């Protein structure tokens, strides 16, 4: 029929959006640039993720187009969810980068944003751990190949012994916080509840103290960073609003808002 | 959603504008921003962008060549309609479309058919000129602004001579093409002296076109003397530039060797007996 609408959304990606990513502090930029795009044409839910994204951003200084996000990205679940059954190593990339979009698009509207987040989280989670031929491979996760937090201390967590379920975790979550200020810490520190090892999220979905504890302390990080950089990230602004800063404050309580963010399943 | 006319638009903003400013056209941002920016409000430019892009990616790729054909007629029909409703808000985008079609006329080159789609995007160049200096395109003319001077320039054609048409008075009907002609020799190595040799039997004053049209046979001297121009600044580029390969085997060198002799090949070439 000719769509002019998802040309200009998509010319409006390569041209406005993808800066957009890597100012965030993000790296990788041609994958941004030219290696998603290209991927968007083999790969439909690709496609609509980033349209959807994009016809968000653009959102901001054209009316209309609020139902173009809305079509976009119910197109984007639905095929994401079954490509997300054939995972092949030929669209892994391709659901990454699908999953990086949505997120970041959930995150730019503010119980709805919850729910897409989690659901494309939980296509990370599907695709972990990827091979390092993957472009996203350094970008979302932490090297963790050698050997605090002031407002709630997990001090008396270490000694962590070699048979610990918080090995990894904590060695996971002190890494993060010293590349704190390396390229991709969004994507990481993002990417965190989703690549959490199956035994310590077992542990925290029954209530383990000492798994909550360190979960909050991931909180703190992740909020204090969305706090300090909400200003210049336009896809983050006003996340705080969204997460409280007594995570308490939450509406069961910091047991029911971990629930909402890890629980359900299909 | 339709991945092709996206993969087509993609290939546009990454692929084709870069080897349209590489031929020697300026105003980079005009190719690679604003026209796609006016393809979104004016669908007949989208087509013709579309078009192009195919016949462009149509090197590389089978199939393709039934979208070529799905999206020029599209971009005609639409123009077609534009072209009588032309306004402020649409004279830019009608003249891209033009630019766009002429190029890509000039891809499938390599009467039969590419002619009769030359003239009648060329007509669109016609019909919007002269262009307000308001417009992005005030790039497709020479400024005939200044003058000359202890009398100042003559153009000289070598291969046959306009030297008998010498001095040229104020009222001689040749005196506004033959001043646009010399001028157009002058800038053949400034930017977008593409766009300005291809324009230039559009833009031609409704006059001496007349004259052309009945067969003037100092009229047809002096093009003669242009098409000697656009053929040698073809010849020589056609190898770099990719939209022009072969556009030797289809404007001959000898004008009188075409199909009715020069005087067909002339008339063929253009569009209406002038009031
Ligand atoms: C926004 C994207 C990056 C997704 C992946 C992250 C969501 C955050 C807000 C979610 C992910 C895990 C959630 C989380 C896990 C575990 C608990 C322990 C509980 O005792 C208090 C709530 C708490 C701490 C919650 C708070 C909200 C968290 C930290
Ligand atoms: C390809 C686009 C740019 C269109 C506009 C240009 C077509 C060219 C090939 C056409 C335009 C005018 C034509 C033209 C006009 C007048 C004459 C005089 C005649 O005694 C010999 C043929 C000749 C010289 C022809 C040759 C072909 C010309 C030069």
Redesign the interface.
Known sequence: ????I???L??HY??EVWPTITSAGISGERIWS?EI??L??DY?FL??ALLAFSATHLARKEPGLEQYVASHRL?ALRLLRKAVLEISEDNTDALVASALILIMDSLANASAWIFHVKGAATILTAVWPLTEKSRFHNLISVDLSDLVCFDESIADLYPVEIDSPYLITLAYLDKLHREKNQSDFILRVFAFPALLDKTFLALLMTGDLGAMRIMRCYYQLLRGFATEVKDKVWFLEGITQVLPQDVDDYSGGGMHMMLDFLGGGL
């Open positions: 029929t000719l769509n002019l998802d040309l200009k998509f010319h390569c041209t030219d795009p290209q968007a044409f439909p496609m609509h197109d």
